[PDB]
Paper text:
The known anabaenopeptins B, C, and F (1, 2 and 3) were isolated from a culture of the cyanobacterium Planktothrix rubescens and tested for their inhibitory activity against TAFIa in an enzymatic assay. Compounds 1–3 turned out to be potent inhibitors of TAFIa with IC50 values of 1.5, 1.9 and 1.5 nM, respectively. An equivalent order was found for 2, 1 and 13 with IC50 values of 1.9 nM, 1.5 nM and 440 nM for the Lys, Arg and Tyr side chains. In addition, we obtained crystal structures of the complexes of anabaenopeptin B (1), anabaenopeptin C (2) and anabaenopeptin F (3) with the surrogate protease carboxypeptidase B (CPB). We used CPB crystals grown in the presence of ε-caproic acid with space group P32, since these crystals had wide solvent channels, which allowed the soaking-in of large inhibitors like the anabaenopeptins. After soaking, the crystals diffracted to 2.0–2.3 Å, enabling the calculation of detailed and accurate electron density maps. The general binding modes of 1–3 were found to be very similar and in the following discussion the complex with 2 is used as an example. The linear part of the anabaenopeptins, which mimics the carboxy-terminus of the TAFIa substrate fibrin, deeply penetrated the active site channel and bound in the carboxylate- and specificity-pockets, while the circular parts of the anabaenopeptins were positioned in the entrance of the channel and completely blocked the channel like a plug, thereby preventing other molecules from entering it. All hydrogen bond donor and acceptor atoms of 2 interacted either with hydrogen bond donor/acceptors from the protein, or with bound water molecules. We found that the C-terminal arginine or lysine side chain (R1 in Fig. 3) bound in the S1’ binding pocket and interacted with the side chains of Asp255 and Ser207. The R1 residue was bound in the S1’ pocket, which is specific for basic residues like arginine and lysine in TAFIa and CPB, while the S1’ pocket of CPA is specific for large apolar residues like phenylalanine and isoleucine.
Numbering used by the authors:
A (entry chain A): 6 to 188, 188A, 189 to 308
B (entry chain F): 2 to 6
Write the structure that this text describes.
C-alpha cells in the first residue's frame, strides 16, 4: 500500500491521487493536464480551499525519473497540507488565500522504467527517428534558449534536448497548462535531486533576471529556514554559474513567461547516496524542505 | 542531476 515514508511505484501513486482527493474533497481536486508518450495520465492536484479568482503557486516533481526523493516530496507536501489545515495557522492562511497546483510526477514513463528496468534512467521514454536510443531530457525540452548550451543533440545522451522544443507530450502539456493559467500562477517551483541547491534563472545564458536581487535574497532566506531543522546546508544562485549552463529548462521558461518567482529545488544529498537516497531519510528531507516551500509561499503572498 | 556533477 501507499506510504509517505517509502518510495511508491506509479500504480500506487496513481491510486493515491484518487484516494487523497476522495478523502479530502474540501481541500483537493484532481485533473490531468495531458498524457505521456506511453499514454499514462499526467495528474495535477489542486490543493486549497476553493474560491473565486485566487492566485496560485505551481509545483511539480519527477521531471527526472531516477530522482525518487522528488516524487516523494510532492506526496509529502499534499498530506502535510491536508493534515495541518485548520491546525497550523500559516498553512491554513495559505490554503485559504491561494491554491497550490501540485504535479506529483511529470515524467511518469521514465519513472516506471526506473522501477521495471533501469534504476538510473533520467529521460522520457519516447522514440527517436534514425536511432534506437530512447528518450528526451524533459528539462532540456522547453523553449528557453532551446538546445544552445549544456544539452546534447545526440538522442543517446542523457541531456538530449529533443527534436524540437516541446517535442515531448509531457513538456508540451506542462507548458500548455501554465500558458493557459498565467494570470493566476504567481510562482513556479520544480523539485529535483540531488545537490542541495536552490536555483533560479538563468541557466540558458549567463545573463541575469531583472529581479535578480530579489530572487537571490528570497533564495538565501529560504535556505536559512531549511537549515533551521537539521542544519542541512544548501547553496543558492543563478543556475548557470551555480551548477552549470543548461538551456531548455522549465524554470527559465516559466520566468520568461512572466512568472517572477521561479526556482529549481535540488534536494538531498550531496553524493554519499545520490539518487538512491535511503527511505529512512525521506521524512527528514521532506520536513526541512517544507520549511523552505512555506517560506517562499508566504513571500509570494505578501508580494501580490 | 547530470552525471557526474
Ligand atoms: Zn533533476
Amino acid at each position: 500500500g501507499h506510504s509517505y515514508e517509502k518510495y511508491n511505484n506509479w500504480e500506487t501513486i496513481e491510486a493515491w491521487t484518487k484516494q487523497v482527493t476522495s478523502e479530502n474533497p474540501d481541500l483537493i481536486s484532481r485533473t490531468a493536464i495531458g498524457t505521456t508518450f506511453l499514454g499514462n495520465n499526467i495528474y495535477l492536484l489542486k490543493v486549497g480551499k476553493p474560491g473565486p479568482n485566487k492566485p496560485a503557486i505551481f509545483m511539480d516533481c519527477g521531471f527526472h525519473a531516477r530522482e525518487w526523493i522528488s516524487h516523494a516530496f510532492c506526496q509529502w507536501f499534499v498530506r502535510e497540507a491536508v493534515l495541518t489545515y485548520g491546525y497550523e495557522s500559516h498553512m491554513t492562511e495559505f490554503l485559504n488565500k491561494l491554491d497550490f497546483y501540485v504535479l506529483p510526477v511529470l515524467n511518469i514513463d521514465g519513472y516506471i522504467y526506473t522501477w521495471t528496468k533501469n534504476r538510473m534512467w533520467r529521460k522520457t521514454r519516447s522514440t527517436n527517428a534514425g536511432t534506437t536510443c530512447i528518450g528526451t531530457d524533459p528539462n532540456r525540452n522547453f523553449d528557453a534558449g532551446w538546445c544552445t548550451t549544456g544539452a546534447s543533440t545526440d538522442p543517446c545522451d542523457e541531456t538530449y534536448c529533443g527534436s524540437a522544443a516541446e517535442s515531448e507530450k509531457e513538456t508540451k502539456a506542462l507548458a500548455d497548462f501554465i500558458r493557459n493559467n498565467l494570470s493566476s500562477i504567481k510562482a513556479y517551483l520544480t523539485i529535483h535531486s540531488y545537490s542541495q541547491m536552490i536555483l533560479y534563472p538563468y541557466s540558458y545564458d549567463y545573463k541575469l533576471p531583472e529581479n535578480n536581487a530579489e530572487l537571490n535574497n528570497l533564495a538565501k532566506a529560504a535556505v536559512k529556514e531549511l537549515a533551521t531543522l537539521y542544519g542541512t546546508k544548501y547553496t543558492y544562485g543563478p543556475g548557470a554559474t551555480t551548477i552549470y549552463p543548461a538551456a531548455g529548462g522549465s524554470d527559465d521558461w516559466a520566468y520568461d513567461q512572466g512568472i517572477k518567482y521561479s526556482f529549481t529545488f535540488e534536494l538531498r544529498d550531496k553524493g554519499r547516496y545520490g539518487f538512491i537516497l535511503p527511505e529512512s531519510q525521506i521524512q527528514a528531507t521532506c520536513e526541512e524542505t517544507m520549511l523552505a516551500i512555506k517560506y517562499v509561499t508566504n513571500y509570494v503572498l505578501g508580494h501580490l | 542531476x547530470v552525471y557526474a556533477f
